[PDB]
Amino acid sequence: MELGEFYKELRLARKLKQTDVACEGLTASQLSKFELGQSMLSADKLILAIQGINVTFDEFGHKLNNYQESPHMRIGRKVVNRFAHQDIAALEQLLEEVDQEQMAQTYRRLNAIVIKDAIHSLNKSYPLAEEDSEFLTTYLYAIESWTWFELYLFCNTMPFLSNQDLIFLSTSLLEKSKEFKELVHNRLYMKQGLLNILSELMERKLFSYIPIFEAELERMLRPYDVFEKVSWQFLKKMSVFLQTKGSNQKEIERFIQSLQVLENPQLTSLFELRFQQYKELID
Amino acid sequence: EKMELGEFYKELRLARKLKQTDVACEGLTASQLSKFELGQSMLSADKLILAIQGINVTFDEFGHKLNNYQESPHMRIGRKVVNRFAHQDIAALEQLLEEVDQEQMAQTYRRLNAIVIKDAIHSLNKSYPLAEEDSEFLTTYLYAIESWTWFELYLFCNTMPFLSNQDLIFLSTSLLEKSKEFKELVHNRLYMKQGLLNILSELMERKLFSYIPIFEAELERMLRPYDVFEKVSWQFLKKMSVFLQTKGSNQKEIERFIQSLQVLENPQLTSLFELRFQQYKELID
């Protein structure tokens, strides 16, 4: 019930004594009064207590929420997943689900815009509204430090931005994401966003802006990041393709075939699909 | 900076540009949030998480900012181990051992982090012993913790050479059940997949081939099409198992497989598999 009572259960599960957690600034008696619900720890002492039981902040928050992710992350991940599966029916159900969930009016409006944008991306006959596009853009400009929620909004509404806003917000992404850039969820979305920026710039023929975002992707990618590395390799070839009337078509075809070594039929189809789509951009 | 949790929350709420009434919902009133921010009352566990999710900040983001954007001691050590191991820097790893000894953490954690470091030193210098007292301490701890958090997944994944054959099998078997509490989390799920890959590697190295199918079944259940690195690693390990059980019958297929990875322009991945391939060749048969 109380935070101290919640913390105490966690400490006992970690099989730690109060003296194991205690350190400079946080005494066992302070931890005891905290666990008894008779006093609250300061912000600095609270972070010591949580680090003292050796659980990640994601784990601490997960158990605090009864082993559910935060509502805004549950919605955003489901939207991304269902859009990636071209699941119009599930997106339409998410729209009514967002309308029935308890959240700030601003967040209800932003989630509806992303979902409606996704449905329109699958079904171009699904109507949109300019007032919604302006509301989301105004929001991204207003938030000074972009959390996972802003990365989710930006990454999935880029096709809908004017060139002016795409260029400015993509440039601002570099600075505005720095506060939370090291976190596991955020860094994954940053790499995916950078790949989507590269795609958008090519499709819009804004080729001169690509190097700024390739340099950022270069700094972020680790040897583990095989999927993003191969995606970037493919997009470098697509940029040449779109700038030279398809001159490197055979090289791209050979590259996709060589991905058979990965024995990943879904991945091969993904690149084959994008290649066929980009072929429609040249005469 | 020394401040109450409510004042810290208020800084965040203003950065999210929400009013107290925007955050308020069922379970959390605006007045409750206000007295929280004013330091006049503390929120219960349920109300605190409502206040944080109500401003669309993850608890990971909340804790990161609360900790002045500093990494966890256990992740800071793990990152330094990774960096220094990649440069084959035994001296720097040994300096990390003395640095851990003065770190602000429980004694148990100082010892366990040291064991992770020693595993790296032993991987670089096989004549560096794996003390039995360390093996006993590690084994007792992993058996004792009923629910394995990210720390135990990280610890287990990086200390397998300290385990006896029996404890490797028992603890590998226990990974499946003991990780379930936090298994869905993104970081934990990554380390469980890596741990399963390392389980397969250890079993092959120890010639315990009959136990491999149990853990391949778990890897099959967990791997997604996005998981390209884990999938290719498993593909490589499947060939290593066939190689070791058939007197090298598929060596040409393995050589062609490594050559076919040239397309990824990833020398670290290619070097990883070539080095491991040579290690398995050096086993006795």
Interchain CB distance below 8 Å, B8 and A43: yes
Question: In terms of CATH architecture, what is B5-67?
Answer: Orthogonal Bundle (1.10)
Chain B residues with CB inside 8 Å of A149's CB?
A: 56-57
User: Touching check for B63 and chain A: CB below 8 Å?
Assistant: yes
CATH topology of domain B73-282: 1.25.40
- The residues pairing with B25 across neighbouring beta strands, listed in sequence order, are B28
Closest residue on chain B to A70 (Cα) = B53
- Partners of A23 in the β-ladder: A26
Tokens 């491999």 sit at which residue? Answer: B212
Superfamily of domain A3-65: lambda repressor-like DNA-binding domains (1.10.260.40)
The residue count for chain A: 283
Contact (Cβ atoms closer than 8 angstroms) between residue A207 and residue A167: no
By three-state DSSP, how is residue B40 classified?
A: coil
Contact call for residues B190 and A224 (beta carbons, < 8 A): no
- Half-sphere exposure (Cβ direction) of B159: Cα atoms closer than 13 Å: 29
- Distance, CA of B27 to CA of B224 (rounded, Å): 37
Place of tokens 């366990």: B112
List of chain B residues whose C-beta atoms are within 8 Å of the C-beta of residue A25: none
User: Which CATH number is correct for A71-280, 3.20.20.70, 1.10.3760.10, 1.25.40.400, 1.10.3720.10?
Assistant: 1.25.40.400
**Cβ–Cβ gap B60/A184 under 8 Å:** yes
Method: X-ray
Residue B90's nearest CA partner among B63, B117, B51, B52 is: B117
Question: What are the structural domain ranges in chain A?
Answer: 3-65, 71-280
SS3 labels along chain A:
CCHHHHHHHHHHHCCCCHHHHCECCECHHHHHHHHCCCCCCCHHHHHHHHHHCCCCHHHHHHHHCCCCCCHHHHHHHHHHHHHHCCCHHHHHHHHHHHHHCCCCHHHHHHHHHHHHHHHHHHCCCCCCCHHHHHHHHHHHHHCCCCCHHHHHHHHHHHHHCCHHHHHHHHHHHHHHCHHHCCCHHHHHHHHHHHHHHHHHHHHCCCHHHHHHHHHHHHHHCCCCCHHHHHHHHHHHHHHHHHHCCCCCHHHHHHHHHHHHHHCCHHHHHHHHHHHHHHHCCCC
Separation of alpha carbons A237 and A247, rounded Å: 10
Q: How far off is chain B from A23, nearest CA to CA, in Å?
A: 7
| Unique residue bearing structure tokens 């979305």 | A189
Nearest CA in chain A to B266: A223
Q: If you search the block for the tokens 């039981």, which residue do you land on?
A: A53
Q: What is the CA radius of gyration of chain B?
A: 23
Contact residues, A window 227-256, toward B, CB-based 8 Å cutoff? 227, 229-230, 233, 255
Residues in B touching A16 (Cβ below 8 Å): 106, 108
Pairwise CB contact (< 8 Å): A262 & B57 = no
The angstrom resolution of this structure is: 1.9
Mutation site, A77, A111, A262, interface B, largest B CB count within 10 A: A262
Q: Residue A187: name the closest of B44, B94, B64 by CA.
A: B64
Choose the closest CB to B49 out of A61, A143, A182: A61
Helix (H) or strand (E) holding B193: helix B186-205
Q: How many CB pairs under 8 A join A and B?
A: 214
- Using a CB-CB cut-off of 8 Å, the residues of chain B touching A184 are 60, 186-187, 190
Residue A179, chain B, CB below 8 Å: the answer is yes
